[PDB]
Ligand binder design. Structure first.
Ligand code: NA
Ligand code: NA
Ligand code: NA
Ligand code: NA
Lengths: 211, 211
């Protein structure tokens, strides 16, 4: 959840917002180790419930998200249902556990490609065109993350947009991402420069992946 | 419906058969002028019911077809339901009226392309990939006709098969078609030559379109 003024500004200038609970357990092995554990349900519930309690009156918020990269666990299903029960006015989405679980109203993959399947074990990233028409599938598809804009990037961006326009149920996506997470450091002469992972003695680090 | 030996040969050699009622009113304006008319229901009914009565014991017959290129009329819906009642063991398909009407268990377009939409008024031929995922659409898609093999043709055949293999609900199609409908004529020396439309003084005719 963002600074409260953000939602007010989105209300007034006009931007659709996905409000997302402060839950990410990416580093766990497997990714759902905590989110499938009922002992972590209380901590998780608070991050979801208190977000909804705060932001539910903002028109800009159109979709609730259960967090990010925390696999798929029983705690997600419980909290998905909690939100649907308390606020039926907004769809709930969540990408974890393969982007099309029982904890999401929207197929919301990250970095699924337009035409190319990436058939990973358990959590495949289908071609977005293909994903829509899998046997039994009826949900809209909106990429929670796509077109990773790291450095000299966004090659093939046009391919996504051609598909979005051609396919009714391909309803767009959210580019990753808005702003380089660089930090200003100063050299011996007091001149500013842009720093990334590792430049503060931080180790282990993931270098330029923050930009 | 074919010569009765055909189904016995398909039973024994092993080919899947779509058995199709002898009903085509292609030249009507509009195409459903007769098939929407209750006065033509008795005539149409006999072409459907007597085919089913003749051929229902052949295992090679896996799908019933209501005919071809006759638009979509109320008579089709009635006969669709008749078959579903008397023989629940086989799906019923029919392409007329846009290939995805209420008279068909299978989206069965003719000459719908793999990636390119042809948005004709009333009876669009969507890209087959796009067609599967149209809002609310759940049926399998099998082209009743595709890859028109007229003369030097079948360009882009691989594009269909790549799509068929990638998309579970794209379950193939029937190439148009098996054999050239050329006829034998003889020159002054008794030498045979292949003839097409118009070669018999027949007019109006559609020339080489029979091949
Ligand atoms: Na779309
Ligand atoms: Na990053
Ligand atoms: Na297929
Ligand atoms: Na022809």
């Amino acid at each position: 959840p963002n600074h409260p003024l953000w939602y007010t500004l989105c209300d007034r200038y006009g931007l659709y917002v996905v409000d997302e609970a402060n839950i990410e357990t990416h580093g766990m092995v497997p990714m759902n180790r905590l989110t499938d554990d009922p002992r972590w349900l209380p901590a998780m519930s608070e991050r979801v419930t208190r977000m909804v309690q705060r932001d539910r009156n903002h028109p800009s918020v159109i979709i609730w998200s259960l967090g990010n990269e925390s696999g798929h666990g029983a705690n997600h299903d419980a909290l998905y249902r909690w939100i649907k029960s308390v606020d039926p006015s907004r769809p709930v989405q969540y990408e974890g556990g393969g982007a099309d679980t029982t904890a999401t109203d929207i197929i919301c993959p990250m970095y699924a490609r337009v035409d190319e399947d990436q058939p990973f074990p358990a959590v495949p990233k289908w071609s977005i065109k293909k994903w829509l028409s899998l046997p039994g599938e009826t949900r809209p598809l909106i990429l929670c993350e796509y077109a990773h804009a790291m450095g000299n990037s966004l090659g093939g961006f046009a391919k996504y947009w051609q598909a979005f326009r051609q396919y009714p149920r391909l309803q767009g996506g959210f580019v990753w991402d808005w702003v380089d997470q660089s930090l200003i450091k100063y050299d011996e002469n007091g001149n500013p420069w842009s720093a990334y992972g590792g430049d503060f003695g931080d180790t282990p680090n993931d270098r330029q992946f923050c930009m």
